[PDB]
Amino acid sequence: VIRGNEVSQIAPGQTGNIADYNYKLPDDFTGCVIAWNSNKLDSKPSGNY
Amino acid sequence: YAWNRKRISNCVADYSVIYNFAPFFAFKCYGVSPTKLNDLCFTNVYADSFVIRGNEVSQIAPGQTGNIADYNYKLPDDFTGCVIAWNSNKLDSKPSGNY
Amino acid sequence: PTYGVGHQPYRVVVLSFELLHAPATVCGPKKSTNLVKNKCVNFNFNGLTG
Amino acid sequence: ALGKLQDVVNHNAQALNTLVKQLSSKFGAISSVLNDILSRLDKVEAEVQ
Ligand SMILES: *[C@@H]1O[C@H](CO)[C@@H](O)[C@H](O)[C@H]1NC(C)=O
């Protein structure tokens, strides 16, 4: 799980926060990426930590 | 048309803390990738800001036609820079028409 | 939930596919056709056509 | 003594061998085999490759 601004960084040949330090794809990556919103389950009024 | 030209010069700019600000989906640039600004450096930065409709953001691309591209601030075709946009029905959306 | 559309949580599931010369341990649903030799045929062996 | 006749043989052998060897290059595509691009991608992207 990630935020909404870091979805586009999950791609081959990308740099940043997730794409440099946490989770990286190879430059010759083939495969499928599935992403969907989780505002219903992963969000709380008190804050999900 | 009241876009305040905040001309920016003579300061070290940290380009990593911009994501903590107002929620743009991506740092939508044209010509430069938004991780190489920390070492590649420019000569003069101009800051502009305006509020437009939902189906008017595509005219703030280099090379476009429409209403903002004709009757308002049109970006040039050879535009080297970044444009940051987001939806704004939280602060500047006062009811009964924000005139 | 009071944040903007760009600060919503997102669930990412990625599938990584192996495309090598290794034997196909897992792949997809075709009914097999019997083998015929010495005839101009349109074969399909482990997903590659010819 | 027959080096020029041998060169007449060898140049025509070598040009044809180079022409056959040039079929294995990708030229910026994802595969050098046409059937893999036909059976692997959709219409527009395989048309590009
Ligand atoms: C920007 O300023 C406004 C009002 O001064 C404030 O409500 C808002 O939280 C500020 N933005 C951030 C990212 O803190």
UniProtKB/Swiss-Prot annotation, chain A:
It comes from Severe acute respiratory syndrome coronavirus 2 (2019-nCoV). Residues 3-5 are annotated as: Integrin-binding motif. Binds to host ACE2. RBD also interacts with the N-linked glycan on 'Asn-90' of ACE2. Cleavage of S generates a polybasic C-terminal sequence on S1 that binds to host Neuropilin-1 (NRP1) and Neuropilin-2 (NRP2) receptors. Interacts with host integrin alpha-5/beta-1 (ITGA5:ITGB1) and with ACE2 in complex with integrin alpha-5/beta-1 (ITGA5:ITGB1). May interact via cytoplasmic c-terminus with M protein. May interact (via N-terminus) with host bilirubin and biliverdin, thereby preventing antibody binding to the SARS-CoV-2 spike NTD via an allosteric mechanism. Attaches the virion to the cell membrane by interacting with host receptor, initiating the infection. The major receptor is host ACE2. When S2/S2' has been cleaved, binding to the receptor triggers direct fusion at the cell membrane. When S2/S2' has not been cleaved, binding to the receptor results in internalization of the virus by endocytosis using host TFRC and GRM2 and leading to fusion of the virion membrane with the host endosomal membrane. Alternatively, may use NRP1/NRP2 and integrin as entry receptors. The chain holds residues 401 to 449 of 1273 of the full protein. This is Spike protein S1.
